[PDB]
């Protein structure tokens, strides 16, 4: 399949070179998989989701996304126009309030919710979790992510937007999960992107166009934008049967575009997510 005039991030993950605008992908499109978006919520009524998105859990007075961040990430995972896996199912878990903030205990409970709730869902191709959030180091937030990965859920987390070593940030510093950095359309490391040895992969993160609340769209930047690219790719590769939840991050690193990114600090891998699709 080919989507003309796709967002630059979608065209990048299916390209060996930057500067293209057509997203190529197998038409399975993540059908049969499920991706949890652990964020501020999802505006499920957005027509871009085509009824494939729904809120399954909230820790606040409403499950509605009154922020736009969680809707934007879910749009990058599997919206029809701005999504990597255009046929996956999206389950919203609102652990962040409408200001984008949330206590670590609530975030920890949300990860343990996904660990159990996936047994209540129909995901024969596998389950993915997309964590576009982060804060200071916390061994309990890290261990909640390891428990989530250990249960058979591909956990993709943001490296962080501190332009520092992600070792001092959770759940970014949890080694068992997939820590994702951000790059821009000229294959440069995003000026805000965290780095370090804990990073597993890079994804498009600067000026990413996706859904927004109010049935609208907008373009924002952040490692929180690169994480849904990897998560959607994992649900895409898992539906194709190319990998599993325990080995998706390793498989994505193995098939990534190598050495194409600039301003990658010494010790940080120079890998860019790549779906390896041949039309």
- 177 marked as binding residue: yes
User: Using CA atoms, how far apart are residues 2 and 26, in angstroms rounded to an integer?
Assistant: 9
Q: What is the resolution of this structure in A?
A: 2.1
Residue spans of the domains in the chain: they are 2-272
Residue 21 falls in the annotated catalytic set: no
Residue 229 falls in the annotated catalytic set: no
Bridge-based pairing of strands 257-258 and 2-3 is: unpaired
User: Using CA atoms, how far apart are residues 36 and 54, in angstroms rounded to an integer?
Assistant: 10
CA–CA–CA angle 257, 260, 264 (5° rounding): 115
What does the block give as tokens for 92?
Answer: 């919203």
First and final C-alpha spacing in the chain: 7
Determine if the peptide bond prior to 50 is cis (ω within 30°).
Answer: no
Which method was used? Answer: electron diffraction
C-beta of residue 235 within 8 angstroms of C-beta of residue 125: yes
DSSP the chain: -EETT--HHHHHHT-SSSS---EE--TTTTTTEEEEEEES---TT-GGGTT-EEEEEESSS--S-SSSHHHHHHHHHH-TTT-SSTT-EEEEEE-S-TTS---HHHHHHHHHHHHHHGGGS--TTEEEEEE---EE--HHHHHHHHHHHHTTEEEEEE--SSSSBGGGEETTT-TTSEEEEEE-TTSBB-TT--BSTT--EEEE-SSEEEEETTTEEEEE-SHHHHHHHHHHHHHHHHHTTS--TTTHHHHHHHTSEES--BS--TTS--EE-------
Query: 49: burial class by Cβ within 10 Å (0-12, 13-18, 19+)?
Result: buried
Residue 72 falls in the annotated catalytic set: no
Q: Which of 46, 69, 72, 229 is catalytic?
A: 69
How many alpha carbons lie under 13 Å from residue 78 in its C-beta half-sphere?
36
What does the block give as tokens for 119?
Answer: 């047994």
Q: Which of 28, 33, 39, 173 is catalytic?
A: 39
- 4 marked as binding residue: no
**Which neighbouring-strand residues pair with 158?**
180
Q: Breaks in the chain at C–N > 2.5 Å: after which residues?
A: none
Bridge-based pairing of strands 33-39 and 89-94 is: parallel
CATH code that applies to domain 2-272: 3.40.50.200
- 16 marked as binding residue: yes
223-239 vs 69-78: helix crossing angle, rounded to 10: 30
For residue 45, how many other CB atoms are within 10 A of its CB? 11
């Amino acid at each position: 399949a080919a989507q003309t005039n796709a967002p630059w991030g979608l065209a990048r993950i299916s390209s060996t070179s930057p500067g293209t605008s057509t997203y190529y992908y197998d038409e399975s499109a993540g059908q049969g998989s499920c991706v949890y978006v652990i964020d501020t919520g999802i505006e499920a009524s957005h027509p871009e989701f085509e009824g494939r998105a729904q809120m399954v859990k909230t820790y606040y007075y409403s499950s509605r996304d009154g922020n736009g961040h969680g809707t934007h990430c879910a749009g990058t995972v599997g919206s029809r126009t701005y999504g990597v896996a255009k046929k996956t199912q999206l389950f919203g878990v609102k652990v962040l309030d409408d200001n984008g903030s949330g206590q670590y205990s609530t975030i920890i409970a949300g990860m343990d919710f996904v660990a159990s709730d996936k047994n209540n869902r129909n995901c024969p191709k596998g389950v993915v979790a997309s964590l576009s959030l982060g804060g200071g180091y916390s061994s309990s937030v890290n261990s909640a992510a390891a428990r989530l990965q250990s249960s058979g859920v591909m956990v993709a987390v943001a490296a962080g937007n501190n332009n520092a070593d992600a070792r001092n940030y959770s759940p970014a510093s949890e080694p068992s999960v997939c820590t994702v950095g951000a790059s821009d359309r000229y294959d440069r490391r995003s000026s805000f992107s965290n780095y370090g040895s804990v990073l597993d992969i890079f994804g498009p993160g600067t000026s990413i166009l996706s859904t927004w609340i109010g049935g609208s769209t907008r373009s924002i930047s952040g490692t929180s934008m690169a994480t849904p690219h990897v998560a959607g790719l994992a649900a895409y590769l898992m539906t194709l049967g190319k990998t599993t939840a325990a080995s998706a991050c390793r498989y994505i690193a193995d098939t990534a575009n190598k050495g194409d990114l600039s301003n990658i600090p010494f010790g940080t891998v120079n890998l860019l997510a790549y779906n390896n699709y041949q039309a």
